[PDB]
Structure formats: structure tokens, C-alpha cells
Amino acid sequence: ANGVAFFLTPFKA
Amino acid sequence: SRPWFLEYCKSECHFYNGTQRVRLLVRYFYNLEENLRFDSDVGEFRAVTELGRPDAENWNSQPEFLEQKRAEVDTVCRHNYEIFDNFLVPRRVEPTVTVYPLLVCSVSDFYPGNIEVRWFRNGKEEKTGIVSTGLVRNGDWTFQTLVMLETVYTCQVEHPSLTDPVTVEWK
Amino acid sequence: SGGKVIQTPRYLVKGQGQKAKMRCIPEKGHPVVFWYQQNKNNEFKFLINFQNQEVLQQIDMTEKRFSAECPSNSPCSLEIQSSEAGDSALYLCASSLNNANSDYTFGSGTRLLVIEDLKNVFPPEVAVFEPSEAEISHTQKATLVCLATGFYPDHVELSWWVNGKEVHSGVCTDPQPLKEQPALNDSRYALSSRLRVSATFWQNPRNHFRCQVQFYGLSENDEWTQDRAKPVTQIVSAEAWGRAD
Amino acid sequence: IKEEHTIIQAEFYLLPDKRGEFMFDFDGDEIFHVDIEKSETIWRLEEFAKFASFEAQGALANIAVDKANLDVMKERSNNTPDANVAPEVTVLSRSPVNLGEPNILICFIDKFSPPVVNVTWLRNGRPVTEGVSETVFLPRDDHLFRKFHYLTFLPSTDDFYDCEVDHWGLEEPLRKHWEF
Amino acid sequence: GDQVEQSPSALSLHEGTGSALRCNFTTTMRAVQWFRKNSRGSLINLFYLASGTKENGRLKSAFDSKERYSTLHIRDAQLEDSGTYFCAAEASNTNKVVFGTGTRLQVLPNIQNPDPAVYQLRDSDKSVCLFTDFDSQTNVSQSKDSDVYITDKCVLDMRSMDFKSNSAVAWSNKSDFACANAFNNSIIPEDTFFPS
Ligand SMILES: *[C@@H]1O[C@H](CO)[C@@H](O)[C@H](O)[C@H]1NC(C)=O
Ligand SMILES: *[C@@H]1O[C@H](CO)[C@@H](O)[C@H](O)[C@H]1NC(C)=O
């Protein structure tokens, strides 16, 4: 159970 | 009509020849229009339309953010490939070939989409009068296709899941 | 301001069941704020994070026992509704710029101590000791020694002031103030410091030396029904003048 | 002997439907998606779950941000003009069809935007509710979306099926036919 | 238990030497951060690394995402490098920042000319004893009987004259107390100068 990684989405403005 | 508003974000990891060459392409959309891009081969945000310029100017002024994103080629992309190379990449599913009357060669239930299908009449590849449907994605990690020959009779199927080519012939 | 995070107060002492409110001003332009609670084992316990006014995440304890808000154009705050002994720790505030990032920049932190009885609180006695003549003959340097004694809790900040200006060069302060009585608990504390200057400088009587100790104790709102003076937050000083041969 | 692949993380938040979506794609097929409401990872094939993991509250956090961003983009854009790209529908069978032999019908809705459709299966002119499966909104190379609808059935020369797809870009609900 | 494996726990460096701190990660980290807490100081931000190496003065930091580690290198150790060092990184497959176990770094100054001595100071009428100018090899031990107090050793730096010196302070109220017997509890240098 090695967990896939994801991109963090940033707040705009 | 009916007004709608969509904030869409696709982060694509492109692998050419395994984890050797990798590029990350993040695309921000608003409704039907792509407005922002992050191309790892560029290393910065670029606005595709004026709508995305504020984000570009804002985020590019953050070196430590850009430093992280350029690095996401290793920390995320190559990371995930390491995981998915255990079951997704090497996944193989053997095709099921069926022939029925124009002569139809039905290749179904196979993965991956790498497939070669030829028509042999009398042992020569009839490289003409070939009507194919193209590759069709069933959406459940299986493919299917119909390759047809318009003559008034054997077809061969080559596939990465097949050590030796599969052949079927009609009467 | 920035790039600096201002946490106030530096120290805080409260009686069990009292409210403990502490404040934090995130760096200028920084919308992300984190609250961490660090114990004696250098463990960082997450409490709550904001972006501007909206709370992104918090834990069960902070939800039930703490109340926090980060008002627009106003200092962020974290308040314990009912203080208990277990809440004695260092509360750290960290601000960022981009939620999808790290690059925390921590504040000075607020040291909170929760005790049963506030009658144990004592201000520090400050005493300055003049350079020994032996050292001057032997080394051509002059060491002043400052002693702060009999205070509680161990919440003090010592500084040396020469001729109205804070100095740092040649200054040495104990890392941790020591218990005057290791046996027993709630014991009052002691703290020492040295300021070494050239012999010629100490022998100039126009030069003014001051040892200043900031004590963090009770506030004006806190009740005090004892005979002795109210042990509030205050400055306690002692000083000495230059002395010729 | 060259492995050439693609992994896509697609997420969005949609108004006025007030729904968000999160999924991972590998070479055009769904690896998984996250039920935003339920907060649990939904692997496209059950067999995947033995090999990988995804922390779901990560996806929830994103959509929360995507929600907020949508308001920012709305206020930003001077005029948001409604425009629609109509779907193209195709119905066909997962396997070669044999009479009396269990099979699956596939409704391939492709090349559309926004991600909102009404899709209805029709056995002999009437809607079916039993044996139907649905796919979240899948990504493409472009800005458009893709979707799959499935129907389990037993073949007979008496039955004929249809897949009917309605989308804000179509004048008339598109109905695609399939019989033996 | 859910922190980053950071080694070593504690560290002593002679002034002008160097050594390395290291974090071991249990998975691919997105980026690494290094902190230092002074003596009564705030947490000072040292580095933010996402890849490769960064160098800041006498500090160099390295981060290898793949090999799952990060190192902080101190060279030419100075007095002000003393403190507690923390690393902090967030995993690529989570949303949460996790911290290292911490490293306590103590830097021992180089005393060129040791001059161990004990002086007595009068109130500007209390009196105190000052053990000073000894080398870093000398260890100060706590006073036993409860009426005499001794502080741990401390280093001061006269920047103007490029001179550093160790010092410890001892005091009491008991009438049997004299500077001669103040620091008897410790193993002091044999040639300690005793005035008066
Ligand atoms: C692709 O990379 C593999 C190793 O991963 C190598 O053996 C092969 O020669 C490479 N192919 C090309 C065309 O560079
Ligand atoms: C689906 O049907 C509902 C009413 O049944 C309607 O409000 C909605 O607009 C329809 N969706 C589309 C895409 O036409």
C-alpha cells in the first residue's frame, strides 16, 4: 500500500 | 439559455521512454477556454489568454513555488510511475479473435491498444480494400476493433500479450 | 510587517480554568496561518490552520477546547476557554504565502504555563555586582555580574543597557534559570548574567551600566487580595556607574 | 521496446450544479476517482486497490480550493459567454454479440462540455433502471470531456435498445440505436 | 512516532570544525525545510529545498527526493551556530507537513590563552564568585549544599577585540561561604588563580 501522489492546487488571488 | 461556470485543472505527466525523459504540463481551464499553463520545459507559468495573466504574474514572483513545481517531475510524476509500473504499465490482456461474413475480423477484449491486424488471402497480405473501424476504447481497460476486407481468407493478429501471433481462417 | 512574525505575549501564566488568549501577526501579505503546539519533547502538534478568515482544518481538541479567529486587518488569536495543566506548552504561529507550498516562517512563540494557585507568583530581585579589582590587574578587562533571584515562574528576559543603549557584545546569560530549591515544586527561580568590558572603559565614571529584567506575570485585570504587592508584569532594574582607580 | 505513457490528474468544480470531481487517468483510462461527498477512493477496477492507495481527504481539499477559485475567475472575467460543445454519441457492444449469451452495451458520449448530461437507456422504447453503470467525467487531449454508460443485457431478436443523451448544446436529444 | 528521523540527537563541535545533520524520509517528499532555534531566540528559517543543493554562508543543504534524505552541513562552526535544528517536509502523497525529531548543536569556543581564575564581586551589600577564562575542556558541576548556588558555564564574545571567554557564577548567603571553596565541587584546572 504505497500511496500515489497528487498536485496541490493553490488559491488564486 | 442556462449559464454555467467551470474551473478545470489538468496536470499531465508525460513519460517518453520510461522515467528517462519526463515533462509536466499543468493546464488551467475556465469553461471552454484554456487560460493558464505550466510547462516544465519552460519552468514558469505562461498565460494562454488574458484571463490567466494575473495568476501567472502572481505565481512567477514566487521562486520557492516555481522551484517546487519544476521539481514535481521527480516528486510526483516519476514517483507515480514507480507505483503504476507494478500493475498498470505491464498489464496484458489476451485478445479474442472471431471471423464472420465482406469478411470481418473481430478482435475484442485486449490490452494494451498496441495491435497489428492483417488480412491474408492465399498467404499474401491483402494490403488493399481494407475497411477498419480504428481502435475503440471500452473504458474498462479493454479495447476492441473490427478490421474488414472487401473481397468476394485468413487474418492474423499480433499483440504484446501474445508470444506467438494468433491466426484464424475461414472456409 | 515582515519578514517577521510577531507573537504576543512572549510568556503567559494563567490559573487553571482561566482564559488564555494569545495573538499572532502573520507576515505582511501572508494569507496562510498555522498554529502549532510544541511540548518538552520537541514535538509539533498541529492545532488549526486558516486562510485569511476561513478555517481549512483543525483538530477535535481545538474544535471543543480552543477558539481561534483571524479577523481581517486584525491580529490572529488563539484562546483557551478553560486552561488546564496539560495546556502548558509553546504555542507557535507560522505564516505562509501559498497554501500549496511550505516555506513556513515561525513566530517568536508564546510560552504558556498553567498552575493551580496564582499566589505562587513572585517578581524578581535584581542586583548588580561591580568588577573585581583583581581581574582588572590580571586581565585588563572588567566583568560585571547581574543576578535575578526569587521570581516565579521562570518567565524573564534579561538585557544589558550601557549609556541608554542596549548592548549584546560581551554579554552572557544563563541558558536556563535554575531552581533556588530543586526539592519541592513551584520553587522560585534564579538567573545570572555577565557583561565584560575593557578595563579602561569600566574606569570611566561617565559610563552608565544597567541590568534590566522583564518579568511576565499577572495582568491588571487579575485579582489580588494578598498583603504584598501585586506581582504584575513589570521591569525590575539594577545599575552601576563607572569607577576610576 | 519504448515505453511511452501519460498520467493525468483532472479535477474540476461546476456551477450551478455545485459538484466537484477528482480523478486519475493512465493512458486514457481511469485509474480511480474520489467521491467528494462520501470521501472515499473509488478504483476503476477492484483489482487495482491491492497495489495502490490514495489519501482521499487530499482530493477533498483540492475541490474546496477549486470551488473558491471559481468565484475568483467569475469576478475576474468581464463577460462569461455561455457556449456549448455538443456531444457525439455512439452505442455498441463490449463483446461480439451471441444470442442468449450475456453481454454489455456501451454508450460512448464523447467530445462535450460542460460536464453535465442526462443519459437514459431505452429497452423497446422504455427506460431501464436495472443493470446500468456510469462513468465519471473523463478527460481528453482538449478542453472537452468524455463519458461512458454501460448496460448489461441478454440478447434476443425481439429486443432493441437505444441510448439517449441530452446536453445543453443539442437542439434535440440525441438518440442512438442498436439492434441485432 | 510520526516525525522525521533526524540524526544526530545532539552534537558538539569545536569552534572552526564542521559536521552534518541528516533527515531520513519514509517516502517521496515534496520539498524540505530547515530551521534553527537560537538561545531564547525565535525559529529562524534557514533553507527551502525542493531539489539539489543550496548554500548559505557557512551552511550548505542538500535534498535528494529519490534517495529519501536531506542533509544540513555546517562548516567553520562559530559560536552563533549553537541551537536546535529542525527539518520539516511534506510528503508528496499527503497534505500535511511533518517535522524532524530535532538536533541540539553546541559549539565549544577555542580558547587560545587559558587563564583560569576566581574573583569576588561586591554589590553596587551582597557578594558573588566568578569562575572565568577557563578552557572548554573544563566542566562546571552543580553546588551541593542547598545554601550555595552555581550556574552552568556560559560563553561571551567581545567582538571588538576578538576575544571569547568562559564563565560561571556562584553565590550564597551562608556565612561559611568563601570564594576559595565555592567551586570545590568541580574538577577545576590545577593552576587556577586565586586572588586575595
Ligand atoms: C529507452 O530507455 C531504455 C532504458 O530505460 C534504453 O535501454 C533504450 O535504449 C532507450 N531507447 C531509446 C530510443 O533511447
Ligand atoms: C436534465 O433534466 C433536468 C430535468 O429533468 C433539466 O433541468 C436539465 O436541464 C437536464 N440536463 C440537460 C443537460 O439538459
Give, in words, the CATH class of C117-245: mainly beta
Q: Tell me, what DSSP letter sits at residue D65? A: H
Q: Which ligand 1 atom is at minimum distance from the Cα of B18?
A: 5
What is the number of the ligand closest to the CA of B81? 1
- The answer to whether the E1-109 and E110-193 domains have the same CATH topology is yes
Residue (of E44, E19, E24) closest to E34 by Cα position: E44
- Contacts for C27 with CB less than 8 Å, ≥ 6 apart: C1, C2, C3, C4, C5, C95, C97, C105
> Could you tell me the sign of the dihedral formed by the alpha carbons of E123, E125, E126, E128, in that order?
positive
Q: Give the end-to-end CA distance of chain B in Å, rounded to a whole number.
A: 59
- For chain B, how many residues are written? 171
For residue C133, which phi and psi values (nearest 5 degrees)?
Answer: -70, -25
Alpha-carbon distances of D42 from B142, C38, C83, D135, rounded to whole Å: 19, 37, 43, 11
The 10 Å Cβ neighbour count of residue B127 is 8
Nearest CA to ligand 2 atom 12: D167
Q: Nearest CA of chain E to the CA of B90: how many Å?
A: 22
Which chain D residues are Cβ-neighbours of B80 within 8 angstroms?
7
From the alpha carbon of D116, which atom of ligand 2 is closest? Answer: 13
Long-range pairs, C88-91, Cβ under 8 A, ≥24:
C88/C112, C88/C113, C88/C114, C89/C37, C89/C38, C89/C39, C90/C37, C90/C38, C90/C39, C91/C7, C91/C22, C91/C35, C91/C36, C91/C37, C91/C38, C91/C47
How far is ligand 2, taken at its centre, from the CA of residue D168, in Å? 8
For chain D, which residues make up each domain, given as ranges?
3-81, 82-180
D3-81: CATH class: alpha beta
3-class secondary structure per residue, C148-166: EEEEECCCEEEEEEECCEE
User: What atom in ligand 2 is closest to the CA of residue D167?
Assistant: 13
Q: Can you say whether the dihedral through the CA atoms of E69, E72, E75, E77 is positive or negative? A: negative
| Conformational region of residue C123, where left means phi above 0, alpha means psi within -120 to 50, and beta covers everything else | beta
Fold classification of D82-180 (topology level): Immunoglobulin-like (2.60.40)
Neighbours of C18 (CB within 10 A): 14
Ligand 2 centre to CA of B58 (Å) is 39
- Report CA-CA distances (Å) from E166 to C176, C191, D36, E83, E193: 16, 17, 62, 18, 15
C-alpha cell of C48?
488549526
CATH superfamily, domain E110-193, is Immunoglobulins (2.60.40.10)
Per the structure block, which three cell numbers stand in for C210?
Answer: 544597567
Q: Do B32 and D143 touch (CB under 8 A)?
A: yes
Strands (E), chain C: 6-8, 11-15, 20-25, 32-38, 44-51, 54-58, 66-69, 76-80, 89-96, 105-106, 110-115, 125-129, 141-151, 156-162, 165-167, 171-173, 178-179, 189-198, 208-215, 234-241
Ligand 2 atom 3: residue of nearest CA:
D118
Check if A1 contacts E (Cβ < 8 Å). Answer: no
Cα–Cα distance, E13 to D47 (Å, whole number): 54
* Cα–Cα distance for residue pair D31/D9, rounded to 1 Å: 10
Crossing angle of helices B63-72 and B53-60, rounded to 10°: 100
User: Of C19, C14, C156, C164, nearest to C78 (Cα)?
Assistant: C19
Residue B107 bridge partners (DSSP) = B97, B145
SS3 C22: strand
Residue E168 CA neighbour count, 13 Å, CB half: 24
Distances E125 to C73, C130, D32 between C-alpha atoms, Å: 52, 11, 80
E174-179 — which CB contacts under 8 Å span 24+ positions? E174/E145, E174/E147, E174/E148, E177/E147, E177/E148, E179/E118, E179/E119, E179/E120, E179/E129
- Solved with: X-ray
Superfamily of segment(s) E1-109: Immunoglobulins (2.60.40.10)
> Residue D176 burial by CB count (10 A; 0-12/13-18/19+): exposed, middle or buried?
middle
How many degrees, rounded to 5, is the angle at CA C67 between CA C63 and CA C72? 120
End-to-end CA, chain A: 37
* CATH code for the structural domain at C1-116: 2.60.40.10
Domain ranges of chain C: 1-116, 117-245
Domains C1-116 and C117-245 fall in the same CATH topology: yes
Do the bridges between strand D52-53 and strand A2-3 make them parallel or antiparallel, or are there none, so unpaired?
parallel
Q: Please, what are the domains in chain B?
A: 1-90 (3.10.320.10), 91-171 (2.60.40.10)
Domain boundaries, chain E: 1-109, 110-193
3-state SS, one letter per residue, for chain B: CCCCEEEEEEEEEEEECCCCEEEEEEEEEECCEEEEEEECCCCEEEECCHHHHHHHHHHHCCHHHHHHHHHHHHHHHHHHHHHHCCCCCCCCECCEEEEECCEEEEEEEEECCCCEEEEEECCEECCCCEEECCCEECCCCCEEEEEEECCCCEEEEECCCCCCCEEEECC
Residues 90-149 of C with CB under 8 A from E: 92, 101-109, 127-132, 134-135, 138-139, 143-145, 147
- Residue C38, all three cell numbers: 510544541
Report CA(E158)–ligand 1 centroid distance (Å): 63
Q: Are strands B21-30 and B5-16 parallel, antiparallel or unpaired?
A: antiparallel
Chain D: list its partners (3+ Cβ pairs within 8 Å): A, B, C, E
> From the CA atom positions of chain C, what is the Rg in Å?
21
Query: Looking at chain A, how many residues does it have?
Result: 13
